[PDB]
Amino acid sequence: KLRVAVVGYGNVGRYALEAVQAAPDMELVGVVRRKVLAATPPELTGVRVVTDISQLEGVQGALLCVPTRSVPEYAEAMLRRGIHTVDSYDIHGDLADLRRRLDPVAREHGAAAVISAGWDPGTDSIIRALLEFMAPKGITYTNFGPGMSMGHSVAVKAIPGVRDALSMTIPAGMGVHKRAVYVELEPGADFAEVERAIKTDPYFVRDETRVTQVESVSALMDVGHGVVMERKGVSGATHNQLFRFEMRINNPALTAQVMVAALRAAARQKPGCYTMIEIPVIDYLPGDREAWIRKLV
Amino acid sequence: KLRVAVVGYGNVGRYALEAVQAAPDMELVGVVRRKVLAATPPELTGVRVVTDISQLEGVQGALLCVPTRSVPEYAEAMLRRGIHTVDSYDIHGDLADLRRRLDPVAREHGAAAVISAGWDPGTDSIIRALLEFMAPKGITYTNFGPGMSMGHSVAVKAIPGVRDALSMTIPAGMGVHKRAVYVELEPGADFAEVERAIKTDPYFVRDETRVTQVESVSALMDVGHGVVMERKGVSGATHNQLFRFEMRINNPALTAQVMVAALRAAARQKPGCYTMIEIPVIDYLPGDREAWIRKLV
Amino acid sequence: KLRVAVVGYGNVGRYALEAVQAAPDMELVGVVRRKVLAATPPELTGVRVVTDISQLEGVQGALLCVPTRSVPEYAEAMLRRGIHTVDSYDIHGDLADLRRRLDPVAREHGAAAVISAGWDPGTDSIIRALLEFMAPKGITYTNFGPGMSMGHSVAVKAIPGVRDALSMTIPAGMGVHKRAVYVELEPGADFAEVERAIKTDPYFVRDETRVTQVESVSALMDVGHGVVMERKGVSGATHNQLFRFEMRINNPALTAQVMVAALRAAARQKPGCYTMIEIPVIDYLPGDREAWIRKLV
Amino acid sequence: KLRVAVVGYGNVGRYALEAVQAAPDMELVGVVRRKVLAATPPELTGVRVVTDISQLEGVQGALLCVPTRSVPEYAEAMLRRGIHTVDSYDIHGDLADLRRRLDPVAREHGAAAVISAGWDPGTDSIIRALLEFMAPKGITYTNFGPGMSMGHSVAVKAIPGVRDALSMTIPAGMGVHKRAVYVELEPGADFAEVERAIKTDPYFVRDETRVTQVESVSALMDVGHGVVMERKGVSGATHNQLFRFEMRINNPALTAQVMVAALRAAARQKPGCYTMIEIPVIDYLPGDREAWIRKLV
Amino acid sequence: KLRVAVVGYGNVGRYALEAVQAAPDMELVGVVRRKVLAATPPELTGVRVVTDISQLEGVQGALLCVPTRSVPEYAEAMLRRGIHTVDSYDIHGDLADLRRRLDPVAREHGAAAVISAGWDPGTDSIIRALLEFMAPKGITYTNFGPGMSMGHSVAVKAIPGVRDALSMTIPAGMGVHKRAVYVELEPGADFAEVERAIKTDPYFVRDETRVTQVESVSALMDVGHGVVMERKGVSGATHNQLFRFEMRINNPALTAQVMVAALRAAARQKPGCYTMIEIPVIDYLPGDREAWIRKLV
Amino acid sequence: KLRVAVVGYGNVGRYALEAVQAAPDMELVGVVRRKVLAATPPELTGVRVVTDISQLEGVQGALLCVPTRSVPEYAEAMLRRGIHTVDSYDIHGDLADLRRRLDPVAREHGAAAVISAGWDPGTDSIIRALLEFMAPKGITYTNFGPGMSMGHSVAVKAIPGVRDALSMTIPAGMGVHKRAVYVELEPGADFAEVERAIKTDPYFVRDETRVTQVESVSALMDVGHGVVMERKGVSGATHNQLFRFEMRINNPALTAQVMVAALRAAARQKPGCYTMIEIPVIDYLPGDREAWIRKLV
């Protein structure tokens, strides 16, 4: 069994714990987190929790459940220890550059790193690749939501006067998205001001955005999310081939599970860095290939 | 460019021709077929057509567009020539055994063979694998149709008294299928007899089957088909994750296009035999990886 | 305006009354029914009601709102008076023969008769014709319900021991239908007996039928109905053209409205008998053609 | 069999060729096109191709597969030769005037012309007419796409600096549409400039438009299209009657097939000009009426 | 049986008449309306119609089918007579205040009043309450239409130059609505002026609004309407619970039926004022509780 | 805050724990369960767990999370202690008798009991009641699944030779259901035998049942479930009113949350026994009524 450690303990983290414990081919060595209180959280009962991975014995792979901005440095740090890594880095714009950066680091330390292994980027990327070669000429549209956006939500919370906030991603169709923000204000804060700060923030300025003040944001919080991917294209010279993929899932739960499968695959690769479309799909499945070929193909 | 030959000229074959001609990284050397008449078919104008692949110059890969029962022998024959091969062998029951048989033949002759590369088996297999690792605990249902089944149709035509026939695959849900057969009888043939021969044939006996006599079967023929794949499962320890994939496509057109993508991938593999879930998805896309990673991930 | 009479007063009849009153190009002369009591029904207040068409002045057209079995004789009777007629005769198997029977009768008396002008046969017939020429090669499926079937219901009411009942038509897909019967038994009637008489009745024997006993059938009665017509076919040489038409409507209300439109068309035809696919669609629209061409084409 | 000629060779043209060849009641005499090079296109192998219809023997009907702006003149030219004509003229605002212009020309030369015989205008027009008389009071919405708009796409290409481009029609609901334009710029062309020229063009100014620059437009080209027609209206005096028609098809393939059916109908009409709602639907079906009535009504 | 009177005679009124007549536990004493002409309307034949409730004998309950602005005063007037009342007051913003105003009036006179008993507010309110306690953390979206809005329509009719008009409510998703207005102008009226007066009216200024001029608005009128209520929330600590409720109905017909059920419930309550979520659902069902518990639970 | 105890610890139990902890108006006193081992389960860390409710201080209400057959006795035992109770007893055929049995027990001990408070019976019951009074004449169909049936699954496990198994409930439409059973056999057990024992069992005999042998049942286990409730009925005298309610949820999670809401309501009722349709919906919401009325109505 692959000895694994969960690094970082947040949403994906708690879900990461469950994903690893449920894996038939993995052994959870422990959890690495910034804070370890005397009052051990219920789900962490019986689980080794430390502040540094060096305090976990013989860790072979690590799930990097830390904020996107922290992924690059964390990945390099773990790889330099010879530990395989998996993350769900979600910036489509430069994940290709992240791959280029980590590839030599991983190879030089005899480890494998699989980046952007969530559902998007991640499994949705594989789906987009399938639709692309099944019908080479055409257009694919990826429509997200209804679901909460962590990035957009954080941006709102960073605004003075905001006690808490939730930014909902709403599909407008054809790959366009609208934003529905719900904000809980600090005592005496001005809504008009906050509303402006939100609608004009570079993270919202490009999309239709609506803001609503609420008594409690936690009362509106749900981590479910979804996607509708569609493509209308040409297979060979035959037009109007229609494809549609839809998912309604628990965001952090799925992300954590995909990360687990991706780490399983990482341990099977030659040293280096990979995105999910660079790994044979069967490497994401536990155990020998034969049984899976007979069951799934 | 990969020098390719289309072996066998039928539905998938004519669609195979178009798939290859539309590929940016391939050069169609010609078509291999059993019959070459003086009256050259319109679409084959300007295309080299011969009865043996040895008459095609420097062929590097071949699309085996022949009947399923002919695939094993054809694949071995081409592999023994050092030619990469792709087929859409559709028998789920023993394609794993086909893989075992062809693997050493391919490797011994320095070639790669990708079997069962249609949409099912094929791309649907990849999808099933994705749903499997995204939510390990649960059940996946693959529902086919409405669409014509070649195998079932042939069986009906093999029945004395049948001039022509068409067997429609109808989804009953939860992976169960019904059959709607339309038959055109020979002069003086008995419908009751044929109907019995159909409903009791081992290819129909297990499913609800209905037979209708028609004046003309060709007037009812359409090669469109489709699938609805669904899974409700557990990601980690989180239940009720919902997934759905649907496709409404031209059967032979899609199959031929996938075969083309699979042959592209074959040329990039170490010698041996592979099913589509044993190949990194990016290998199915033409050209360098970098651009695809930036566009799709 | 066309002087019209409603002949027969039942569901379609009451709905026929409203359809005529709402027509901008028609004048309701009155209603012909076999029962005319002193206590005139509310909706018939201010409406001339008689037992014979001869007592209605200058009637030019008549809506035959009588049972299917009574249509042939009523149509001939009205046509022989020089009155245009419309009916919704619903027997697909013999309406073609009805057409040949009424054609010379209509022509000989200088009148036009449009038969089977409901939604099926009728408007659905036109739709099926369109899908047929838009994609000549393929199969069209017409799926009815959920909705009550008059014929099936009356058949059940004919069974001794049944105080009242209704038969629901349920679509099973691919043109196949199931039956859901609800029966109210007379005091002291035996359910098992009735159930058997139903499931073995020639009107039910060939379809999956379920029977449920209820305290009151009137409490379950709703005249809504619907249809889903689908076709997957070849336009020219291009396969997998997809078409779908769905309707959720009040059965008798729509039938009566279509009959009104068909009578309007009848008044514009050369004497003879027509089905709805034998009349230019614009003849079903009131007033000059020009305006409709600009509005709808 | 009706001797037919395909005039103009483009998308609808190639599909026009297939539609005619697939028609059981027509004989393709040949194709009329502007250029006839020595290297005969594969599909035109064995087909007579000339630059003037006078060089085609005994042509009785012609499918005018030329640009919309060329239809009026081509129709008159062919009608003046006594040849029946069919076109898919798609300008809803003036086709009524086209009808009035061509009517006397057609009649004076003993020929019939059916204009605007595509799917919209054309078959969709018939559908709108049906929904109108089935429920006279209400509103019908016709929602197009996702699908490429030839007209909008040509407008973009007419702009200096654009090498190639395609305009996608996107349904916003309630008959409102948005435009998604993808453009391939000429070497050293300015995107901002082109983008402005597009969004400002009179063909786009009224609709929400988005422009994206792509490396290759041909790689995004698909001729599939679709429509969703819905009506909520009153049948007689009964409100909320619900109707819905949806289609997902190959645009030029369907258009060409409808044109073929309309030409068939043209040959059966009294001399003059007709829109598709002025012809009995059965005239669009090949052969005797009887068989179709028993089969479809 | 509860002796009931219908107060006010309009859409909901005529539908109110039918709802009461169809109730098994009610006896219609008569209708109260401000206009009683010699030519008694057909449906009111045999029904006592007067201008004051005092002229109806032993009335125990009244359906207030009057405009929203007239509800408060009518409710107080009837309650002060000891008559139970039901209304469908639709102003979400102040109905809570209406409740506090009517509560002591109802109690003081020994009667019960159920306010805002339509489908929204009303039954939709109950649904929203259920979804709220089934999944306490999340957001519920109520999407209305396509359907005519009385308030929006009357507002447009108030604009000088407008002979008649109707405003269609269009769902844009996530609780946002657009408006589609159709207007019939008085002879010599200016469209541009009217259009501006509409789009800038406080009832339209905050929503995307489109105005179309038509020859006749009555030809576009249909009272059908609908709703789609959705919620994605957390049950306990389990996220992504999905709920969806949809309705396609005749607006005034349903409203009147709900009012009838609510009046039935009113007669069973302690004196005071209630909204529909303050009454046990079984009190809306006629007769003893036992039978309903066995039938529905 | 209401002091609550969770009685019985299983699926609904673990979810019951979370539901109570998430309730703003409740204080979890502890959990009552049959076995309390030294190794305290992680989620029960910090939670008082005992074998008898008497060892929990000042408990005011209890969620009976025990098997259906144990509910009657447990309810009486808790009620006799003056503790309010809530259960999700799911036998539609006898819950009415349960209500009559518990009513006097509850009242005599000054407590309130709400029975059958899951989603069906429970919240679905309220929905059925709503659809019933909104459209009194018609038929409502409740279609369950895809989802695991605890009862059917237990029945299979009770069969000798089966190590483990799960029975999936499949909707066939119109309230009819099919069963899909997956069984894991004990070492050396006979499948044919087990298959017969299953399909013949009184819990399966009436429904179409399919049995499949699998290597592992736990690998197929998911507690997600769902329902589609539909009604087509008459509001007043207006037919074809259409209603549809769908839910895709975690079965035990929802059940536990509804039970929590029902216990909250129980504490607010006069002593006695109630089904969910006998309680005003607002009593299921925490805190004062005013806020909820302004927010939801």
CB contacts under 8 A, E 32-51 vs C, are: 40, 42-46
Q: What is the resolution of this structure in A?
A: 1.9
Give the residue ranges of DSSP H helices in chain B: 11-22, 71-79, 95-108, 123-134, 150-157, 191-199, 251-266, 289-296
Nearest to C43 among E40, E43, E248 (CB): E43
* DSSP per-residue string spanning chain F: -EEEEEES-SHHHHHHHHHHHH-TTEEEEEEE-S---SS--GGGTTS-EESSGGGSTT--EEEE-S-GGGHHHHHHHHHTTT-EEE-----TTTHHHHHHHHHHHHHHTT-EEE-S-BBTTBHHHHHHHHHHHHSSEEEEEEEE-SEEEHHHHHHHHTSTTEEEEEEEEEEEETTEEEEEEEEEEPTT--HHHHHHHHHHSTTTTTS-EEEEE-S-STTT---EEEEEEEEEEEETTEEEEEEEEEEEEEHHHHHHHHHHHHHHHHTTSPSEEE-GGGSBGGGGSSS-HHHHHHHH-
Which H, E and C letters describe E169-211, residue by residue? EEEEECCEEEEEEEEEECCCCCHHHHHHHHHCCCCCCCCCEEE
Is-contact E65 E150, C-beta < 8 A?
no
The answer to whether E173 faces chain A, any CB pair under 8 Å, is yes
Do β-strands D84-86 and D112-114 pair in parallel, antiparallel, or remain unpaired? parallel
Amino acid identity at A18: E
Least Cα separation, residue D189 to chain C (angstroms) = 38
Would you say B53 and B32 are in contact if contact means Cβ atoms under 8 Å apart?
Answer: yes
What is the C-alpha separation between F219 and B137, in angstroms, rounded? Answer: 5
Cβ neighbours around C229 below 10 Å, total: 21
Question: Do the Cβ atoms of A76 and A87 come closer than 8 Å?
Answer: no
> What is A137-250's CATH topology?
Dihydrodipicolinate Reductase; domain 2 (3.30.360)
A223 touches chain E (CB under 8 A): yes
Task: Inspect the interface and report whether the beta carbons of E232 and A224 lie closer than 8 Å.
Answer: yes
**CA-based nearest residue to A227, from A203, A208, A251, A206:** A251
B67 is in an annotated binding site: yes
DSSP character string of chain A: -EEEEEES-SHHHHHHHHHHHH-TTEEEEEEE-S---SS--GGGTTS-EESSGGGSTT--EEEE-S-GGGHHHHHHHHHTTT-EEE-----TTTHHHHHHHHHHHHHHTT-EEE-S-BBTTBHHHHHHHHHHHHS-EEEEEEEE-SEE-HHHHHHHHTSTTEEEEEEEEEEEETTEEEEEEEEEEPTT--HHHHHHHHHTSTTTTTS-EEEEE-S-STTT---EEEEEEEEEEEETTEEEEEEEEEEEEEHHHHHHHHHHHHHHHHTTSPSEEE-GGGSBGGGGSSS-HHHHHHHH-
Contact at CB, D296 and C243, closer than 8 angstroms = no
Q: Does domain C1-136+251-297 have CATH number 3.40.50.880?
A: no
Of F42, F46, F248, the CB nearest to A46: F42
Tell me the DSSP string of E74-102: HHHHHHTTT-EEE-----TTTHHHHHHHH
- CB contact (8 A) between residue B42 and residue D42: yes
Chains with at least 3 CB pairs less than 8 angstroms from chain F: A, B, C, E
- Cβ within 8 Å, pair B232-F168: no
Backbone angles phi, psi at D236, to 5 degrees: 70, -105
**3-class DSSP assignment, residue C18:** helix
- Which residue of E lies nearest to D235 if distances are taken between CA atoms? E222
CB A32 within 8 A of CB A57: no
* Residue B160 marked in a binding site: no
Read off the amino acid at residue A25. Answer: D
Backbone angles phi, psi at E251, to 5 degrees: -50, -70
Long-range contacts of B230-233, Cβ-Cβ distance < 8 Å, separation of 24 or more: B230/B140, B230/B141, B230/B143, B231/B131, B231/B135, B231/B138, B231/B139, B231/B140, B231/B141, B232/B138, B232/B139, B232/F146, B232/F222, B232/F224, B233/B131, B233/B134, B233/B135, B233/B136, B233/B137, B233/B138, B233/B139, B233/B140, B233/F222
CA distance F213 to chain A (A): 14
User: Torsion-angle region of residue C130: left (phi > 0), alpha (psi -120 to 50) or beta?
Assistant: alpha
Q: Within the 109-138 window of chain A, which residues sit less than 8 Å (CB to CB) from chain E?
A: none
Across chain C, how many H-helices and E-strands are there? 8, 14
Per the entry, the structure determination technique was X-ray
B15 contacts on A by Cβ (under 8 Å): 235-236, 238
CB E227 within 8 A of CB F251: no
Whose tokens are 């598709």? That residue is D276
Least Cα separation, residue D234 to chain E (angstroms): 6
F272 among annotated binding-site residues:
no
Which run of H or of E encompasses D291? helix D289-296
Domain spans in chain C, listed from the N-terminal domain onward: 1-136+251-297, 137-250
Establish whether the linkage from the previous residue to B146 is cis, with ω within 30° of 0: yes
Phi, psi values for residue A204, rounded to 5° = -125, -30
Q: Which residues of C touch B176 (CB under 8 A)?
A: none
D172 touches E at CB < 8 Å: no
Contacts of F159 (CB under 8 A, 6+ apart): F194, F197, F198, F201
CA distance D263 to chain A (A): 26
Q: Are F276 and F295 in contact (CB under 8 A)?
A: no
Q: Which tokens is E168 given?
A: 């269609």
The reply, when asked if residue C70 is annotated as ligand binding, is yes
For C29-50, b where at least 16 C-beta lie within 10 A, e where not — what string? bbbbbeeeeeeeeeebeebebe
Please say whether the beta carbons of C99 and C71 come within 8 A. Answer: no
Name the closest residue on chain C to residue E40, using Cα atoms: C45
**CA dihedral sign of residues B209, B214, B218, B222:** negative
d(CA F137, CA F237): 9
Residue whose structure tokens are 């929904």: D131
Contact D222 A138 (CB under 8 A): yes
Concatenated DSSP letters of C210-261: EEEE-S-STTT---EEEEEEEEEEEETTEEEEEEEEEEEEEHHHHHHHHHHH
Positive or negative torsion for Cα C120, C123, C126, C131: negative
Looking at CA atoms only, how far is residue D159 from chain C in angstroms?
Answer: 31
Cβ within 8 Å, pair F223-B239: yes
Asked if omega into A42 is within 30° of 0 (cis), the reply is no
CA distances from C134 to A188, B179, D259, D281 (A): 66, 26, 9, 12
Interface test with D, best of B14, B31, B45, B222 (most D CBs within 10 A): B45
Residue in D173, D174, D233 closest to E222 by CB: D233
Pairing of strands D162-173, D176-185: antiparallel
Report d(CA C281, CA D123) in Å as an integer: 11
Separation in Å, CA F155 to CA F146, F161, F183? 19, 13, 12
Residue of F nearest to A24 (CA): F219
Place of tokens 């792709």: B86
Count of beta carbons in the 10 Å neighbourhood of residue A141 = 17
What sign has the CA pseudo-torsion A296, B4, B7, B12? positive
CA-to-CA separations, F268 to C153, E255, E282, in angstroms, rounded: 48, 31, 18
F280 interfacial to chain E (CB closer than 8 Å): yes
Closest chain B residue to A120 measured between Cα atoms? Answer: B297
Which secondary structure element, helix H or strand E, spans residue B234, and what is its range?
strand B224-235
Given CB atoms, is C242 within the 8 Å cutoff of chain B?
yes
Of how many residues is chain F composed?
297
**What is the CB neighbour count within 10 angstroms for residue D146?**
20
Å between B143 CA and nearest CA of chain A = 14
**Residues near C71 by beta carbon (within 8 Å), at least 6 away in sequence:** C64, C87, C89, C98, C115
Closest C-alpha among C243, C213, C250, C254 to residue C118 = C254
Minimum Cα–Cα distance from A248: chain E residue: E240
* Interface probe, candidates B133, B139, B235, chain F, greatest F C-beta count within 10 A: B139
Nearest CA in chain C to E24: C219
Query: Which H or E run contains B240?
Result: strand B238-250
d(CA E268, CA E265): 5
Cα distance from N-terminal residue to C-terminal residue, chain E:
26
Instruction: Give the whole-angstrom CA distance, residue C260 versus residue C6.
Output: 10
Q: Coil, strand or helix: which one is D204?
A: coil
Q: How many angstroms away from the CA of F105 is the closest CA of chain C?
A: 33
Consult the annotation and say whether C74 binds a ligand. Answer: no
Are E252 and E15 in contact by the 8 Å Cβ rule? The answer is: yes
Provide the CA C136 distance to its chain's centre, in angstroms: 27
Report the Cα E89 to chain-centroid distance in Å. 6
Q: How many Å apart are CA D243 and CA C248, to the nearest integer?
A: 7
| Residues on chain B touching A118 (C-beta within 8 angstroms) | none
| Alpha-carbon distance F257 to nearest alpha carbon in chain A (angstroms) | 15
Q: Please, which residues 53-92 of chain A have a Cβ atom closer than 8 Å to chain B? A: 92
Q: What are C95's two structure tokens? A: 């309406």
- To the question of whether residue C248 is assigned a binding role by annotation, the answer is no
Between CA D144 and CA A289 the distance in angstroms is 47
Q: Taking CB atoms and an 8 Å limit, are B240 and F218 in contact across chains?
A: no
